[PDB]
Amino acid sequence: GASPTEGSLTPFIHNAFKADIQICILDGEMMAYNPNTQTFMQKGTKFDIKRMVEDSDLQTCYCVFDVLMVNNKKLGHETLRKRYEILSSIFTPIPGRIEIVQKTQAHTKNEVIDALNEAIDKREEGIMVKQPLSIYKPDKRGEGWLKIKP
DNA sequence: AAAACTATGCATGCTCTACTGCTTCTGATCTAGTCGACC
After folding, report:
1. What string of H, E and C letters represents the secondary structure of A12-44?
2. DSSP letter at A99?
3. How do A98-100 and A59-70 pair as beta strands?
4. With a 7 Å cutoff on the CB, does A125 touch strand B?
5. Nearest partner of A65 among A30, A36, A38, judged by Cα
6. CA(A39)–C1'(B5) in Å?
């Protein structure tokens, strides 16, 4: 949906943005949410989030992890911490339709292994790590973002 | 009493209108495969 009147995810989150924010760019991941369990349907069997069938009870959820512009302010060159803080003041999350990915501060390896073990326990792919001072470099790989899997 | 004209019933041919069977076109359904984009 390109307008609040008609869409599959936008008609519900039109009014989820604080009044001050008028121009806003966000980056995130789109996934499928099962409400009867209140759990995210892991990608794979029984559904594709690209061409979901209307009759299905599953719905679309947007998990945000970055902001690149708010009220004609260019946040590309700022540090990750600042972008996170500004992101916290964009929308009031409304579970099931738009959310912010939680990030935990960690400064030891035991924490990383604990997180990976817990992720495997919750049947997730893995865990990723972000450098607090990393800048957004479009199209580049392995600059401030790292991923870890079993 | 005999001959000529006319009426009516039936035979014959032709043409026109139902009803059954064969062939071909169209529509609806299923099954198999292809393309888009992502991960």
Report:
1. HHHHHECCCCCCEEEEEEEEEEECCCCEEECCE
2. E
3. parallel
4. no
5. A30
6. 118
